[PDB]
Design a protein around this ligand. Sequence first.
Ligand SMILES: CC(C)Cn1c(=O)n(C)c(=O)c2c(-c3ccncc3)n(Cc3cccc4ccccc34)nc21
Ligand SMILES: CC(C)Cn1c(=O)n(C)c(=O)c2c(-c3ccncc3)n(Cc3cccc4ccccc34)nc21
Ligand SMILES: N[C@H](CCC(=O)O)C(=O)O
Ligand SMILES: N[C@H](CCC(=O)O)C(=O)O
Lengths: 255, 248
Amino acid sequence: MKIGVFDSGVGGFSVLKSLLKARLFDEIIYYGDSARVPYGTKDPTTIKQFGLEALDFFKPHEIELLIVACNTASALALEEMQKYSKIPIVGVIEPSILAIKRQVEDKNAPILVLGTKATIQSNAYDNALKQQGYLNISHLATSLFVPLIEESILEGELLETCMHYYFTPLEILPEVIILGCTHFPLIAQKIEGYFMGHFALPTPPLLIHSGDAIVEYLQQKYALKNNACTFPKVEFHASGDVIWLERQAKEWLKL
Amino acid sequence: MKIGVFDSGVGGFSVLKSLLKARLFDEIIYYGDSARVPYGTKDPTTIKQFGLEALDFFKPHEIELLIVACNTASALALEEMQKYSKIPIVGVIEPSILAIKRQVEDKNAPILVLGTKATIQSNAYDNALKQQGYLNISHLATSLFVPLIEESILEGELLETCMHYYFTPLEILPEVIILGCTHFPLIAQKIEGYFMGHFALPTPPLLIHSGDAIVEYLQQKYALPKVEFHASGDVIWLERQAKEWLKL
Ligand SMILES: CC(C)Cn1c(=O)n(C)c(=O)c2c(-c3ccncc3)n(Cc3cccc4ccccc34)nc21
Ligand SMILES: CC(C)Cn1c(=O)n(C)c(=O)c2c(-c3ccncc3)n(Cc3cccc4ccccc34)nc21
Ligand SMILES: N[C@H](CCC(=O)O)C(=O)O
Ligand SMILES: N[C@H](CCC(=O)O)C(=O)O
């Protein structure tokens, strides 16, 4: 089985890592639109066209399924992409909704959605959760987390101050935190730590990881038993910084 | 004269404002490639191509001269753009070098260049300054300044912490600081306040503004109001910003 993975850049690596461990596919074609990253600060119209152009990139690769690892693209371009695509396209939003549905029985549990400005503004998460019966939903566009993470500021006073900037205004004790952005898993522990040290939470909140969530979904939906190639063929492509992207793949994914 | 102004997005407003105040042109065609901003975080080969493509946008407008308000595009794509352009293309780097020549007589004056990662790695300013005889040139990529400014983090603890993160490691105290990025003028007084508050200085460092520098050059070189906005991203948003901040 040969599939594709699309993201605005290298961020999607966080989703790809999960996919690789789950041995769901024998071959993966990763494509990052690095020349235009980030997507999170842009509008729906622009994002949708980006999504459509991504489909064009994959046509020669003859993939049988496309994973939109980008949360922003999943929120703004997924519907349009699915409209014209002949192969199934799976985003990272619905899988997380289902993940929450399975592990969060209390419909009143306070849920906090974190993502880019575009993702949050879209209310993609909020709407899906409401449809599933959840009644305590809060969202925050922690936009600066993206560039900080890209500069590798994964700890220290600057990150702490940035988290403080976004989280201080919160008047809820989150029991569930959605890491609704490809970049957020890289500071998940820091985020959990902030809430445990700045709030009176009795126990750490449940963190929803987009990659683990989509893995769960794919296994069930497509009846995949984790028996694909052990050392799968993976290609990395991008609209820019491709040499760099390949280096990142070897350095962090050992591919 | 009818001219064009190019930037990766809305940032070029810092230059457009200077142009407008100087009442130099009868008509201006502003284009921000907001679908792909930022340029500063990307590699040179990508930025150069972005610049060439920008030229195509202005062709039907029949502009007489093009201003590249973007410091990053000025640093990386200007040479290539001028190669394939018949109309003059003026960037924001050389004009600043000239201003510095006029305002900084002391060749040993410590000069600090601030800009995007791409602009700083190009050594555009350093090379130009070296060529003109300056002996104490420093540079620093204050990358996070761009997104902080776009999110309107123009004061407070977060900006202070970010400036500290970038400035603390400096060993040389600048007497002159070049705001080599469209966004930096929005935190000019804060950058000024940082050095005045962290060191004992009788007078703040001289800040060089890209917009003011290019206005002087244009008046000089060209012995020198309809304004329309275009964008690869949300043009309506850009026009709304123009109405709010430029009253246009
Ligand atoms: C699959 C990842 C969990 C692996 N990984 C890290 O574990 N860790 C710990 C990483 O640090 C890492 C990095 C990394 C490399 C250089 N600078 C910042 C991050 N990168 C590349 C990278 C680059 C930019 C943004 C990214 C956003 C989301 C995932 C990866 C990103 N990958 C990293
Ligand atoms: C720079 C001045 C001509 C106008 N101006 C402000 O004075 N001031 C004080 C502004 O705040 C300003 C703003 C602004 C609007 C919304 N959020 C942040 C900044 N904007 C729009 C804007 C947006 C993003 C990045 C920009 C980078 C450089 C210049 C302007 C930018 N313009 C602002
Ligand atoms: N990939 C984006 C983050 C980076 C961007 O804004 O392009 C997301 O998951 O929302
Ligand atoms: N216009 C850029 C800043 C924004 C970007 O990186 O594109 C500059 O002047 O360097």
